[PDB]
Design a protein around this ligand. Structure first.
Ligand SMILES: [Mg+2]
Ligand SMILES: [Mg+2]
Ligand SMILES: [Mg+2]
Ligand SMILES: [Mg+2]
Ligand SMILES: [Mg+2]
Ligand SMILES: [Mg+2]
Length: 224
RNA sequence: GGCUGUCGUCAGCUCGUGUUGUGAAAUGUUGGGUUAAGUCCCGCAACGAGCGCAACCCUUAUCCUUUGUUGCCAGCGGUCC
């Protein structure tokens, strides 16, 4: 991935100096106007070393789960995983989506059966008042569980945009040994993720970049 | 044992799995709104479920169909009215 490209995106940008996390000292060039700057020279080799790892999982038809619920990087997230044939989460992660599979699995069945009882027309020939609680009931399920609806079991790797914001998923993923690939940032803990990609996690330009790239490689890897 | 009063027809009382705590425990069941109501909605390390709440039951208020004696008399005709 082009080291010039990122100057363009804004990846070098971090967070205000005061909100920094001192575990990210390694991945810092310095500060300008009391605002931190990611040493991109550390980003790019780290990043390419996570693309590679992602390839060889995507090789064996494992499932890259993508998570990103920021009211920036949601439509960004959906686009990418769909542009790959994988799974995604872009509205609140709901605690135990991984550790409590048994149960959360048993709320997918419902969403399946509410999809049927919609196209099949049952959500029409009924109480009319009961096309409220038989639709809102679906609408929400397909806002939350939708992304992972046909996922049948636990992922083979989470790919996570913001570590800070999505700390619950990462802990759950550590809980299950599921390897994690995060876009950590100057203000975030390095310490829970396995393939740390430094750089900005809060920009429409920056996110699409890493997504596009991880999208490219899982498709370039889902072939051989 | 069975049956019954009572707080109280008050809106509460809990469980599975997950998570937190060395542990009793906690979370859910808190928060913003709303409601007669843990009523409903939005949020949220919770995700769900159950007993309650409400609804299904009887009665009362209006209308329609069918049936018309031992009940009824609007229009007719008669009358010991
Ligand atoms: Mg423990
Ligand atoms: Mg209580
Ligand atoms: Mg409690
Ligand atoms: Mg409490
Ligand atoms: Mg409340
Ligand atoms: Mg209830």
């Amino acid at each position: 991935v082009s080291m010039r490209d990122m100057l363009k995106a804004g990846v070098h940008f971090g967070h205000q100096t005061r909100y920094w996390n001192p575990k990210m000292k390694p991945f810092i060039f310095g500060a300008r106007n009391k605002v931190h700057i990611i040493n991109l020279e550390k980003t790019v080799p780290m990043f390419n070393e996570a693309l590679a790892e992602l390839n060889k999982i995507a090789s064996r038809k494992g499932k890259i789960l993508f998570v990103g619920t920021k009211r920036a990087a949601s439509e960004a997230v959906k686009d990418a995983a769909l542009s790959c044939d994988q799974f995604f989460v872009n509205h609140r992660w709901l605690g135990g989506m991984l550790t409590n599979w048994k149960t959360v699995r048993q709320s997918i069945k419902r969403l399946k059966d509410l999809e049927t009882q919609s196209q099949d027309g049952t959500f029409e020939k009924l109480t009319k008042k009961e096309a409220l609680m038989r639709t809102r009931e679906l609408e929400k399920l397909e806002n939350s569980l939708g992304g992972i609806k046909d996922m049948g079991g636990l992922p083979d790797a989470l790919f996570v945009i913001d570590a800070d914001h999505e700390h619950i998923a990462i802990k759950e993923a550590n809980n299950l040994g599921i390897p994690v690939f995060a876009i950590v940032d100057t203000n975030s803990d390095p310490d829970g993720v396995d393939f740390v990609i430094p750089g900005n996690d809060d920009a429409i330009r920056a996110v699409t970049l890493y997504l596009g790239a991880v999208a490219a490689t899982v498709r370039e890897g889902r072939s051989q």
